[PDB]
């Protein structure tokens, strides 16, 4: 980042924002991972038993990212509007 002695670009420009400390404990569940949770019930703790999210995660969201195929049961998570329209399109109930 040395520019000669001209003020460098990473010091010419303003810092912005903050680190959330809640984005570190959230993860996204693709619909590809709703078949691997070993039981048809997607809890938070059963996504960790299949090594999908991560052991330090407290919040997971199920997003529309590919091919839910099975009768599934999402309990205690958040789902999007597309993922809710796909889980129920394959015969799944969200709690």
């Amino acid at each position: 980042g040395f520019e000669g002695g001209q003020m460098p670009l990473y010091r010419r420009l303003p810092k912005f924002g903050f680190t959330s400390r809640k984005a570190a404990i959230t993860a996204e569940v693709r619909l590809s991972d709703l078949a691997k949770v070993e039981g048809g019930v997607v809890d938070l703790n059963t996504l960790k038993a299949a090594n999908i999210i991560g052991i330090q995660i407290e919040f997971a969201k199920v997003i529309l990212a590919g091919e839910v195929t099975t009768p599934v049961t999402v309990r205690g998570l958040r789902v999007t509007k597309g993922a809710r329209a796909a889980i129920e399109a394959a015969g799944g109930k969200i709690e």
């Binding site: 980042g1 990473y10 010091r11 420009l13 303003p14 810092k15 924002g17």
Partner: peptide
């Protein structure tokens, strides 16, 4: 460069 990690994403 930690001062760059606050200026760019």
């Amino acid at each position: 460069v930690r001062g760059a990690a606050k200026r760019f994403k």
